[PDB]
């Protein structure tokens, strides 16, 4: 019976909530109240990359912390040399509605995807001279929102059809399918060991999936609206999610519950992108008020404000060595702060 | 090294000139979004002009227009609709005849949501009302009534500036003008000058849709320039 199943699910939810309540004896804020604040954080726009024609949605730093990739609505995927500001590559796209991009850890490939429901893979290291389309993925029934490279052969993608897909590049087929979300999955983050990944959808919940097992392990429901950003802590034990309710929230995999909420009264605009510093002390979040906020991840204190962008901030990334932070916005410019 | 630096500079300048040419091409073309229901009959409209997203390229008076359809996307459109905020216009398709569900009310709610969106406040909407012949024949038959869905239709009065087509009885003209006035009220509720609505009456056999869209886009761009010079 449907009613019996609903009652059983409700009882299970009550049991899980009671277990979480019993497992929570102290809050992170009062435990961290004894440490000194990081103080005011001042960052200047060290670099300003120009050349895109339309708004930029996504960017991804390279493992060398020097080359980055950006995707814009003009059908352009531009690979930038951050050190010298010179453009390294400019790949035209068949579909101009790109909404995500990824850069391979080896640096030989880049990923693309958008409203075409296609996750194209471009090979940078071509013997014939310039970048050409390498692989085509045509399995998702919804728009691609995020994609990340596990290696040169396996990729993970999130789509608007409430499902995630683990693809094998050579075969071009869905090696694994992750289902369970009830809303459009907007972002995914890869754990440092590349064994687990967290995905946030438009249902105020974040789901943790095992790459090898292909099944959902934990579900976190603390947000009030759609989650637009997600990112692990530097260690594979916590992750931060920014939502449309103008709040960011920190969740611990082991605790399986909320840790800390970053929000302010004057902030009434949703968060588009979040990221952590190298040590995880600073949490950088891009907002819809044309500004980015750097919070203290341990004290929920607004450490700094970056206000260089004149339009909505769409993407934000931190280098592997944590030297600089790059912000892309709905204007035509990328910014690099240090 | 100096050699690698100069090679990088040469690659950068080649990319820059290619991007300049592509910028000229991009500014030459005008992008439009197309939106409507399944029963709204936008397929015949596309055929009049003429996968994840469908692209249609057409040249009018040596001006390139790129129309983008909804494609294979779910009904939840609160996320991907933000992409089409810089487009020249959003074409909205409404089946005016629609008798299973109150599709007209759903279309009105969707139009209100699009109009009131914060990211779509600067985007103009061109409204098209199809199934004009179906609405006319269902009004003539009298088996289907609009007063049940809209009780204020009984008290509605045909505007004095209405220009009905020849050979058309006043009943269908009044019904279609009330339907249009609903959208006019929704559009005039908010957004006084940021963006404008351009309703039109069209049928499955009409061929003036191209010229109407061209003229509406020209008017939209002219109004955008005047606003920039604060002349309105």
């Amino acid at each position: 019976e449907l009613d019996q199943l609903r009652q059983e699910a409700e009882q299970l939810k009550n049991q899980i909530r009671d277990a979480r309540k019993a497992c929570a004896d102290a809050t992170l804020s009062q435990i961290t109240n004894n440490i000194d604040p990081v103080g005011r954080i001042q960052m200047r726009t060290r670099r300003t990359l120009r050349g895109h024609l339309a708004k930029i949605y996504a960017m991804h730093w390279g493992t060398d912390s020097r080359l980055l990739v950006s995707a814009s609505q003009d059908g352009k995927l531009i690979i930038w040399d951050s050190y010298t500001t010179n453009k390294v590559h400019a790949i035209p796209l068949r579909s101009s509605w790109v909404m995500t991009c990824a850069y391979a850890p080896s640096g030989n490939y880049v990923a693309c995807g958008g409203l075409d429901n296609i996750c194209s893979i471009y090979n940078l290291k071509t013997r014939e001279g310039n970048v050409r389309v390498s692989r085509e993925l045509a399995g998702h029934t919804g728009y691609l929102s995020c994609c990340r490279f596990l290696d040169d052969n396996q990729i993970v993608t999130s789509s608007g059809d409430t499902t995630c897909a683990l693809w094998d590049i050579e075969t071009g087929q869905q090696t694994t399918t992750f289902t369970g979300h009830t809303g459009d999955v907007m972002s995914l983050s890869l754990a440092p060991d590349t064994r687990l990944f967290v995905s946030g959808a438009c249902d105020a919940s974040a789901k943790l999936w095992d790459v090898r097992e292909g099944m959902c392990r934990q579900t976190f429901t603390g947000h009030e609206s759609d989650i637009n950003a997600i990112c692990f802590f530097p260690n594979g034990n916590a992750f931060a999610t920014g939502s449309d309710d103008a709040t960011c929230r920190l969740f611990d995999l082991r605790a399986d519950q909320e840790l800390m909420t970053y929000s302010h009264d004057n902030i009434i605009c949703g968060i588009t992108s979040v990221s952590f510093s190298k040590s995880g002390r600073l949490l950088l979040a891009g907002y819809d008020d044309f500004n980015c906020n750097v919070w203290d991840a341990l004290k929920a204190d607004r450490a700094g404000v970056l206000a260089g962008h004149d339009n909505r901030v769409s993407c934000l990334g931190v280098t592997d060595d944590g030297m600089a932070v790059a912000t892309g916005s709905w204007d035509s410019f990328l910014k690099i702060w240090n | 090294q100096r050699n690698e630096e100069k090679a990088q500079r040469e690659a950068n300048k080649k990319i820059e000139k290619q991007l300049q040419k592509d910028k000229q091409v991009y500014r030459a073309t005008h992008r439009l979004l197309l939106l409507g229901a399944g029963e709204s009959g936008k397929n015949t409209i596309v055929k009049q002009m003429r996968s994840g997203i469908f692209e249609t390229k057409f040249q009018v008076d040596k001006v390139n227009f790129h129309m983008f359809d909804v494609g294979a996307q779910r009904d939840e459109r609160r996320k991907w609709i933000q992409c089409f905020n810089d487009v020249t216009a959003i074409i909205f398709v409404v089946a005016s005849s629609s008798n299973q569900t109150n599709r007209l009310q759903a279309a009105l709610k969707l139009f209100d949501s699009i109009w009131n969106n914060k990211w779509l406040r600067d985007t103009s909407v061109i409204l098209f009302l199809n199934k004009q012949d179906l609405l006319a024949e269902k009004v003539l038959a009298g088996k289907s009534k609009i007063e049940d869905y809209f009780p204020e239709f009984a008290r509605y009065t045909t505007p004095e500036d209405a220009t009905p087509e020849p050979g058309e009885d006043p009943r269908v003209t009044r019904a279609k003008y009330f339907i249009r006035d609903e959208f006019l009220r929704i559009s005039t509720a908010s957004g006084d000058g940021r963006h404008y609505c351009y309703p039109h009456f069209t049928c499955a056999v009409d061929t003036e849709n191209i010229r109407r869209v061209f003229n509406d886009c020209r008017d939209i761009i002219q109004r955008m320039h005047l606003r920039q010079y604060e002349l309105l």
Partner: nanobody
Amino acid sequence: QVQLQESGGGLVQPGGSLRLSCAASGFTFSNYKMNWVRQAPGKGLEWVSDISQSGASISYTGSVKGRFTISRDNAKNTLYLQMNSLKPEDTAVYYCARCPAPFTRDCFDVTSTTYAYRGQGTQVTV
């Protein structure tokens, strides 16, 4: 966790009155615009009524305009729908829906299937 619970539905003779209650939890009720929608048997989801955050802006569909009333209580974090002069065509499953984002005048895809911020609904038979 955001959740909406609907209650008060039941069998009512034609021309009667009914009261539908929506209890909200997991979010700030006063920061969102609330909606009432219905699904008739063999029919798709359709919007019925909506009420703004403060209750100043209230709108109804034309089918039930002049017979249905919608109200909200932010102190009790609840929503009420008063039904008068009910008709057999009103027999449906009624759902209480919340707008996806707060402080937004627009409200997208509340009548979409598998909406994340919609309650289980209650059956009303006339």
